[PDB]
Amino acid sequence: HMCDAFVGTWKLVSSENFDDYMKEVGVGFATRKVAGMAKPNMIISVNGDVITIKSESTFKNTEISFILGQEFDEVTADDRKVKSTITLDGGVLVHVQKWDGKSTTIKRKREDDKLVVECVMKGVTSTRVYERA
Numbered sequence: 001h002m003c004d005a006f007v008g009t010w011k012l013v014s015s016e017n018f019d020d021y022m023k024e025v026g027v028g029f030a031t032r033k034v035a036g037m038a039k040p041n042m043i044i045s046v047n048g049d050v051i052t053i054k055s056e057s058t059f060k061n062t063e064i065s066f067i068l069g070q071e072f073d074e075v076t077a078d079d080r081k082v083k084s085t086i087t088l089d090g091g092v093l094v095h096v097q098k099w100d101g102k103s104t105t106i107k108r109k110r111e112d113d114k115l116v117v118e119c120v121m122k123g124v125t126s127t128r129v130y131e132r133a
C-alpha cells in the first residue's frame with residue numbers, strides 16, 4: 001500500500017519553467033520545443049514491490065519499473081542514459097538521475113487531488129501539475 005495514492009492515470013494540466021529546466025539539463029533546441037508542447041499522460045502502477053511509471057505523449061513514450069532504493073538504468077525522453085534511484089521520503093517519491101557527472105532530482109507529491117512534480121537541476125526548478133485522467 002506504499003504508493004497507493006500515486007496509483008492511477010494522470011494528465012498534465014499545467015507546466016512552469018519546463019523549458020528552462022530542460023535547458024539546464026542540456027536538452028537541445030528542437031527537442032525542447034517539441035517536448036515542451038506535449039501534454040503527457042503519466043500512468044503509475046504497483047505490483048508487489050515493483051512500481052511502474054509510464055509516460056505517454058505525442059513526442060515519446062517512456063516506461064520505468066523499479067524497486068524503491070534500488071538503482072537502475074533509465075534512458076530519458078531526451079535520450080540521456082542515466083543511473084536512477086527512487087526512494088520514498090516522507091510520502092514523496094524522490095527520483096535522482098545521475099549522468100556525465102551531473103545530477104537532477106524529480107519529486108512527485110500528492111497535493112489535494114493533484115499529483116505535483118518538481119524537477120530541479122542546479123538552481124532551476126520546474127513544476128508540472130497533473131490531475132486524474
Ligand SMILES: O=C(O)c1ccccc1NC(=O)N1CCc2ccccc21
Nearest residue numbers: 035038055057059060062077106117128
Ligand atoms: O513531463 C514531465 O512532467 C516529466 C517530469 C519529470 C520527469 C520526466 C517527465 N517527463 C517524461 O518522462 N516524458 C516522457 C515523455 C515526454 C514527452 C514530453 C515531455 C516529457 C516527457
